[PDB]
Each structure stands twice: as structure tokens, then as C-alpha cells.
């Protein structure tokens, strides 16, 4: 750990600075260093961790999609052979993406999830675990693809079970978990009907609980509800 000599508090401070500078690779490295101090993460710290790696892997995924698109075209009937370079470079980006996912999954397994007892932390981390297995699933093609998919499903399912028992239906973590598990169903598990059912039921149960919220909590919940509706509009 190249961050082993830096104070935990300094790592968190620098993660916030890296965010302001839109230096998300640095942000992720600082937050990995903070996790490796071994202490549990506060709510703010968990979100710094998730923001950092979401931005890093999001860029990798966007690049992979561009390259995969170019690669598939080079393989159509009538394309001029261009050699191994597109495949090689897609593989390079894919391997770096898998590395980032494995890093995040490693942090969750050593030892964030096992120490997470409160619903807000445990559901958050299990959602992340589902998310990063989902990103691995997006690029998987081998003997392991079904097992990667089932790892994502299992993490999301455990998070869902806890969230339904322990959080109100408007809790933004619960909502974001359902949003993403719904996308998993649609895009990974070839289960569009499950995706649509989950998004719709989540939206309706949240709507009925909005009356309990403050203005600020209302804004947070309705933002994610709008994403659920956006996806439903995309899919119907």
C-alpha cells in the first residue's frame, strides 16, 4: 500500500481535493488507502469511496463499449482485416477494468462487508458488490460468466432483503439499489419483465411514503424516483 504512510484523515482530505480537481483515479487511490487503515467508514466516507470508483470504472466502461463496437464492426461481412490491434486494445482496457472491479470487490471482502452491521452501511456495500460484479458481467464471455452473474444477483438480493426489512421505501440507498438491480435484470440477466416490475413497484411504494419526509429528504428520494421512471420510459 503506497498510502500506508499517510494519515487516514489526510487521505480523506485529499480524496475530497481530488474530487474538486476531477482527479478520480487519485480519489480512488486515496479512498483505497483510507479503507486499508482498517477502520469502518462513515456515511460520507462510504460515498467518497463509491463516487471515486464509480467515476473510474464508468470511464473504463465507456471506453470498452467504444472499442467493442469498433471490434464487432471489423468482424462484419465485408470489413477489411485490420489485424489484431482492435482486439488487443479492447482486451487491454477490459483487463484494466477487471482489475479495478477486483480491487473494489477486494476492499468489500477485506473487510468492509463483514464489519458492516447497520443497514445503511451493509446495504450500501452489498449494492456496490452487486454493481462491480455487474460490471465484470458486462465484459464476461467465458466459463465463469454465469457464476459472475450469479454473484451479482446474490449480492443485490441480500441487499434487497435487508433494505426491505430495515429501511423505509423512500430511503435513497434502497431506491438506488432497486434502480441498479432492475438494470441488472434488464441488461445482464435477460429478465426485462423482472426489471420493469421491480422499477414500478419500487416507484409506487416510494410514492406512498413521500408524505413522511422533510423537504430535503423529499428532494433526495424524488430524484432517484425520477431515474426509475426514466428507465421505465426507456423500456415500455
Amino acid at each position: 500500500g503506497a498510502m500506508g504512510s499517510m494519515e487516514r484523515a489526510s487521505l480523506i482530505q485529499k480524496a475530497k481535493l481530488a474530487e474538486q480537481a476531477e482527479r478520480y483515479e487519485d480519489m480512488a487511490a486515496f479512498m483505497k488507502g483510507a479503507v486499508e487503515k482498517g477502520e469502518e467508514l462513515s456515511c460520507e466516507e462510504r460515498n467518497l469511496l463509491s463516487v471515486a470508483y464509480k467515476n473510474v470504472v464508468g470511464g473504463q466502461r465507456a471506453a470498452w463499449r467504444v472499442l467493442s463496437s469498433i471490434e464487432q464492426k471489423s468482424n462484419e461481412e465485408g470489413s477489411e482485416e485490420k489485424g489484431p490491434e482492435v482486439r488487443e486494445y479492447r482486451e487491454k482496457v477490459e483487463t484494466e477494468l477487471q482489475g479495478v472491479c477486483d480491487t473494489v470487490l477486494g476492499l468489500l471482502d477485506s473487510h468492509l462487508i463483514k464489519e458492516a452491521g447497520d443497514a445503511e452501511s451493509r446495504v450500501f456495500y452489498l449494492k456496490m458488490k452487486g454493481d462491480y460484479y455487474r460490471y465484470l458481467a458486462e465484459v464476461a464471455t467465458g466459463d465463469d460468466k454465469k457464476r459472475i452473474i450469479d454473484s451479482a444477483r446474490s449480492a443485490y438480493q441480500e441487499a434487497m432483503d435487508i433494505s426491505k426489512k430495515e429501511m423505509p421505501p423512500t430511503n435513497p440507498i434502497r431506491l438506488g439499489l432497486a434502480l441498479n438491480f432492475s438494470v441488472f435484470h434488464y441488461e445482464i440477466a435477460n429478465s426485462p419483465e423482472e426489471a420493469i416490475s421491480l422499477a414500478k413497484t419500487t416507484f409506487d411504494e416510494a410514492m406512498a411514503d413521500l408524505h413522511t419526509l422533510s423537504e430535503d429528504s423529499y428532494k433526495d428520494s424524488t430524484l432517484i424516483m425520477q431515474l426509475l421512471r426514466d428507465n421505465l420510459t426507456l423500456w415500455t
Binding site: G176, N180, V183, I224, L227, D230, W235
Partner: peptide, 5 residues
């Protein structure tokens, strides 16, 4: 692509 958070 669909929205995720």
C-alpha cells in the same frame, strides 16, 4: 444506456 447510481 439506462440510469444507475
Amino acid at each position: 444506456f439506462p440510469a444507475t447510481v
